[PDB]
Amino acid sequence: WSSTADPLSNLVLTFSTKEDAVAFAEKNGWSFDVEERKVPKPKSKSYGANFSWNKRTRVSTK
Amino acid sequence: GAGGALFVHRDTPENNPDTPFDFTPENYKRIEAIVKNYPEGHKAAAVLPVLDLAQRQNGWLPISAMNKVAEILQVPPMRVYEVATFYTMYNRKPVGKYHIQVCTTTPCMLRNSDSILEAIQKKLGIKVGETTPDKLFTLIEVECLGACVNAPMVQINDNYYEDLTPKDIEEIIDELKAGKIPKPGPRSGRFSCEPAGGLTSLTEPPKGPGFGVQAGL
Amino acid sequence: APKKTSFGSLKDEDRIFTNLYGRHDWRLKGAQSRGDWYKTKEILLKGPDWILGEVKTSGLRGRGGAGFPTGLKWSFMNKPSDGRPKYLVVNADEGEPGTCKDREIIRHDPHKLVEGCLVGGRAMGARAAYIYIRGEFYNEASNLQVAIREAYEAGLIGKNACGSGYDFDVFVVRGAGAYICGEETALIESIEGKQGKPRLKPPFPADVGVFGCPTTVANVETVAVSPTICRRGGAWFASFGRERNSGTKLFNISGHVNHPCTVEEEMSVPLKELIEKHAGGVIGGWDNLLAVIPGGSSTPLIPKSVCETVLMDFDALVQAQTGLGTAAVIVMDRSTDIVKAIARLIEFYKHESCGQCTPCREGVDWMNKVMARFVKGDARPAEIDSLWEISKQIEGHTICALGDGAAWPVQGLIRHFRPELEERMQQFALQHQ
Numbered sequence A: 001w002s003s004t005a006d007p008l009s010n011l012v013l014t015f016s017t018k019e020d021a022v023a024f025a026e027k028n029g030w031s032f033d034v035e036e037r038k039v040p041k042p043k044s045k046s047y048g049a050n051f052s053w054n055k056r057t058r059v060s061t062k
Numbered sequence B: 001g002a003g004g005a006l007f008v009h010r011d012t013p014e015n016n017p018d019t020p021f022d023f024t025p026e027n028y029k030r031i032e033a034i035v036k037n038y039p040e041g042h043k044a045a046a047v048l049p050v051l052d053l054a055q056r057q058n059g060w061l062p063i064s065a066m067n068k069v070a071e072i073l074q075v076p077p078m079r080v081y082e083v084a085t086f087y088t089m090y091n092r093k094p095v096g097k098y099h100i101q102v103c104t105t106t107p108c109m110l111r112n113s114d115s116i117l118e119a120i121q122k123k124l125g126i127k128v129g130e131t132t133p134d135k136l137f138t139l140i141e142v143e144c145l146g147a148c149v150n151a152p153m154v155q156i157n158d159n160y161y162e163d164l165t166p167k168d169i170e171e172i173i174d175e176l177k178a179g180k181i182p183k184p185g186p187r188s189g190r191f192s193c194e195p196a197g198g199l200t201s202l203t204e205p206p207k208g209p210g211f212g213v214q215a216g217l
Numbered sequence C: 001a002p003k004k005t006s007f008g009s010l011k012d013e014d015r016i017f018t019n020l021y022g023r024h025d026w027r028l029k030g031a032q033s034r035g036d037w038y039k040t041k042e043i044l045l046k047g048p049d050w051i052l053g054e055v056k057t058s059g060l061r062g063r064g065g066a067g068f069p070t071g072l073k074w075s076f077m078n079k080p081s082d083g084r085p086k087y088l089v090v091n092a093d094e095g096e097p098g099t100c101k102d103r104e105i106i107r108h109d110p111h112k113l114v115e116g117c118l119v120g121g122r123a124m125g126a127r128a129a130y131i132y133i134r135g136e137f138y139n140e141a142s143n144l145q146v147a148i149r150e151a152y153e154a155g156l157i158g159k160n161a162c163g164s165g166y167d168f169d170v171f172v173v174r175g176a177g178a179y180i181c182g183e184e185t186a187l188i189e190s191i192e193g194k195q196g197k198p199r200l201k202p203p204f205p206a207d208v209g210v211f212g213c214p215t216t217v218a219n220v221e222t223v224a225v226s227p228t229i230c231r232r233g234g235a236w237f238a239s240f241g242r243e244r245n246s247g248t249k250l251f252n253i254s255g256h257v258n259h260p261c262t263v264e265e266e267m268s269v270p271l272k273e274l275i276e277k278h279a280g281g282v283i284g285g286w287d288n289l290l291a292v293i294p295g296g297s298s299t300p301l302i303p304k305s306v307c308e309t310v311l312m313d314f315d316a317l318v319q320a321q322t323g324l325g326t327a328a329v330i331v332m333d334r335s336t337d338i339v340k341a342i343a344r345l346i347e348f349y350k351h352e353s354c355g356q357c358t359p360c361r362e363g364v365d366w367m368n369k370v371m372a373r374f375v376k377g378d379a380r381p382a383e384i385d386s387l388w389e390i391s392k393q394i395e396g397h398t399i400c401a402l403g404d405g406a407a408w409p410v411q412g413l414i415r416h417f418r419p420e421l422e423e424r425m426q427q428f429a430l431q432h433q
């Protein structure tokens, strides 16, 4: 079986904002690394572009 | 019901990429004329006719013919395979000299297309979807062929034979296997889509160019 | 007496397709003899707006089967050019069971179709016309090509069509056995060398169509009646039929009739009068009638009680919950197994589905299996309601209207012949313990 010796291997905490997590870590004395949230950028979708008269976006199959 | 024909190609001694196929020079001229009917930036539109031409030259479509069509038109082979498997008139397997197609949809079914199917089966001694040992005749069931007024009907090698009785189809088969060309169309003294007797419409002579043209024109 | 109320008897002088039965020369000489290609130069020089106005005031609706107003649809293409060429696509696929009219139009007077192509292209400002003919109509396509060749040598089409200074081409493209390729977007996709799979709307063909260019897809009957409408006026065409149901129509009467045939008749003619006058009556007498499918396989069937007074136009058949469709009348007498007929239609739709979208691809096959079991009687009565719900889950949820055309016949059969299905299930249960 898989054996461990550290008691915090399963500890995961949930927070509403980054600032809340930072405050909790600071008041508990833990040094932390923060990663900014990654949000997918808005994209421009066009179903008509599948059948362009002169562009490369025209699809060869459906 | 079930289609019965697979849509996966497995290489075979008589159907493989090295099977010989090539267009004739006359067919190449016809292909050139076909491609000249579409805008210069869209040559894939010629896939449907050219593929058909290959079959008209070969009788069926080996994978070599599809590869040749794809190479000629600069289209990827998978697109040609897609077209060849989507459309039911393409033969991805050899067929007899005469391809017999019997419409069995409801308008033709109401006028006893089953008798025509049974007469063909009895005359040729083969099941639907089977090809005779001689190989001249191949039989299949098709959907509505657009001649429901003249029912029951049959299509043999892009020829329409209409208003069929079992005797009519027996004579058609007899003169087809005797090397003769049967007369296409109805077989009831009708020869068109008019009523069988009387000609209830269009009896008065048609009128000339300027019969009822409006003023100021 | 204005506002006629009884329709169904028009003489030959008011008929458009005067060579419907092929008793006169279909070549150019015969067409000119019958009034074709007459004063087309003046009509072309009247401008696209005049032609669109004549088509609008005519009240002509789409003869393909949907009945969309033709003038508005054609004027959707009356925009200024943006660089892309403009095209007219004529629909000649003719896949609906029971329908045979366009075949006769193409083979017996293709010059009407060619002149209609020219007039419609001028009205829409189209560079060329593409005619998508059914692949099984080889001889009809060859006749159309011969007529196009005669028109090209006569100067009626091509460079400087007639003397109008308008350049216009006509091309013939043949399909390869696909009913779904009759749908306008699937037809466009098949022209471009792809599988006959419909594309979603919007965009509509007037914005992005064949080769990504503005195009209009029109039925061959709609295109072919247009030059006559232009020559005789929209008022003459609108004098026939009820309001919003103007003009004449081709009817294909098939099934259990003494003389199955194709005729031209005024729109709002009653169904019984048409059947007993042009088709020789129902086999065995009118009292032998069981059911009628009035507008091709996609329309719901109606029992004999409804066919006594129903009229053959869009509105009256909509009020009868059946629709007009392609005006292809299929007659089933009292010796007909109605369940077997509807199951055969569902099998046709299962074999014609393109498979693109989930509801059609799965549900049509599901209903085919259910109806096959219904024919024998294996099912239980509750399944009937289930079947109804299944059809409701297909209709209005698919890319194209093929799903609707498969769902509607079972809805009609359940609506009008539920006791037949129930008694079939009863007999199957009683026979097999």
Ligand SMILES: NC(=O)C1=CN([C@@H]2O[C@H](COP(=O)(O)OP(=O)(O)OC[C@H]3O[C@@H](n4cnc5c(N)ncnc54)[C@H](O)[C@@H]3O)[C@@H](O)[C@H]2O)C=CC1
Residues within 6 Å of the ligand: C062, C063, C064, C065, C066, C068, C073, C076, C093, C094, C095, C096, C099, C182, C184, C204, C205, C217, C296, C298, C324, C325, C326, C400, C401, C405
């Ligand atoms: N002639 C034949 O062989 C067959 C005919 N049909 C008939 O086809 C009918 C259904 O076909 P659909 O095309 O799906 O009907 P639809 O109502 O969706 O479209 C009919 C025409 O009207 C145009 N249109 C409709 N709304 C428009 C809008 N808001 N903007 C621009 N254009 C618009 C469309 O471009 C189309 O060309 C059925 O009623 C059926 O009877 C079906 C199978 C075969």
Ligand SMILES: Cc1cc2nc3c(=O)[nH]c(=O)nc-3n(C[C@H](O)[C@H](O)[C@H](O)COP(=O)(O)O)c2cc1C
Residues within 6 Å of the ligand: C061, C062, C063, C064, C065, C066, C067, C068, C070, C073, C091, C092, C093, C094, C095, C096, C179, C180, C181, C182, C183, C184, C217, C218, C219, C220, C222, C400, C401, C402
């Ligand atoms: C599955 C399906 C098949 C169709 N097949 C045809 C056809 O074969 N011929 C036709 O004219 N219309 C057919 N239609 C209807 C087309 O949409 C119609 O031709 C097109 O809208 C032309 O409009 P119009 O009637 O105003 O000329 C079909 C529609 C569907 C959903």
Ligand code: SF4
Residues within 6 Å of the ligand: C180, C197, C198, C352, C353, C354, C355, C356, C357, C358, C360, C361, C398, C399, C400, C401, C402, C403
């Ligand atoms: S409804 Fe049927 S034919 Fe139409 S797009 Fe969907 S799967 Fe294809």
Ligand code: FES
Residues within 6 Å of the ligand: B103, B104, B105, B106, B107, B108, B109, B143, B144, B145, B146, B147, B148, B151, B153, C097, C098, C099
């Ligand atoms: S039903 Fe047989 S040709 Fe249409």
